[PDB]
Design a protein around this ligand. Sequence first.
Ligand code: GRC
Ligand code: CL
Ligand code: CL
Ligand code: CL
Ligand code: CL
Ligand code: CL
Ligand code: MG
Ligand code: NA
Ligand code: NA
Ligand code: NA
Length: 326
Amino acid sequence: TLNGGITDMLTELANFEKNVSQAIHKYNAYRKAASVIAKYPHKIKSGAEAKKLPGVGTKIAEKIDEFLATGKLRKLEKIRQDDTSSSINFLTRVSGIGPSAARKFVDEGIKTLEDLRKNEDKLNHHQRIGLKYFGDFEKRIPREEMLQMQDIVLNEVKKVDSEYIATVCGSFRRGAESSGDMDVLLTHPSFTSESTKQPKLLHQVVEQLQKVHFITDTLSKGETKFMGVCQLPSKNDEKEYPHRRIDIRLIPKDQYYCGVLYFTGSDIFNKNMRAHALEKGFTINEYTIRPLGVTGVAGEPLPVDSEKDIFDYIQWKYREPKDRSE
DNA sequence: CCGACCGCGCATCAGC
DNA sequence: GCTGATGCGC
DNA sequence: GTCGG
Ligand SMILES: Nc1nc2c(ncn2[C@H]2C[C@H](O)[C@@H](COP(=O)(O)OP(=O)(O)[C@H](Cl)P(=O)(O)O)O2)c(=O)[nH]1
Ligand SMILES: [Cl-]
Ligand SMILES: [Cl-]
Ligand SMILES: [Cl-]
Ligand SMILES: [Cl-]
Ligand SMILES: [Cl-]
Ligand SMILES: [Mg+2]
Ligand code: NA
Ligand code: NA
Ligand code: NA
């Protein structure tokens, strides 16, 4: 919040470029600037001072000077006044509606929550579930609720097969006092990079969680990734908890560290780290870290026994989860 | 200037 | 059906 | 929109 004004401004610009301009690189550019400024330990007094930071350039520095002088940005004022832009930006807040679908809907004259609700037949499944829980999905999850949810997921998985290990990742694993959703990494010894010795490993865990009415809806589901909806149980007479987004990722057991690195994030952290990897001649995904050959074709998986081995390969000091929140 | 910008799972579609 | 491209979301 | 080479 130290430079909250500026970071909010940059994020709104990022959002515009993603949702309206469908310009993903500008979106990332703005997001990177916002990240580096959020980290910066002084109240920025000028654009020039900000432009010192990597990711902040001439244009964002100009914008910062306007913001600091006036408390606002004319470019954003106009955007806010533009109906097409406002509408498109709104609709993308529904899970499953992205920039294109949003713009398509706005061409059909579907512009508001009302419109969506009276045109449910125009929505795919994910989008329908996103509309159903629109309000709920805007609420954050207090950590104390994540702890209750953790306890449920871990216990239920244990009942399915004691050899499963489920790890809560995302902002929770980074120590955040609230989270936008729950991310669960799962492993089981029978699923490795060498073999899938057992089918339905993810399905069985999903079934059990639906069985106990923890998972309530499914947005998408395959052999290794489940994306859906869950809800804590409430007590007699007590108002129900909001429905919450949940993602469960099943990773080969021997690839745990790359998997938990990926799923701990943050997303921007992962992008920065993978980019640095490339500069150092490696490529990192959720499975492996590999060298980039003479040509730039990935080579074979390097051995990894900890998260820190990954950092070591690319010549970064180890960062604890809590310091990966960029 | 001028690319290159992380990397990938699932849903859905077009074209064969 | 299949493969590939595109959208969306992590 | 920013930056490295
Ligand atoms: N490489 C990469 N990893 C990503 C990306 N997006 C997400 N991840 C990884 C990194 C990310 O941490 C994890 C879960 O994604 P979620 O969108 O839930 O991010 P949280 O951090 O949990 C977010 Cl602060 P909260 O859920 O609390 O509101 O997936 C991406 O674009 N790229
Ligand atoms: Cl772009
Ligand atoms: Cl503003
Ligand atoms: Cl690993
Ligand atoms: Cl791989
Ligand atoms: Cl930590
Ligand atoms: Mg999360
Ligand atoms: Na700069
Ligand atoms: Na959306
Ligand atoms: Na998530």
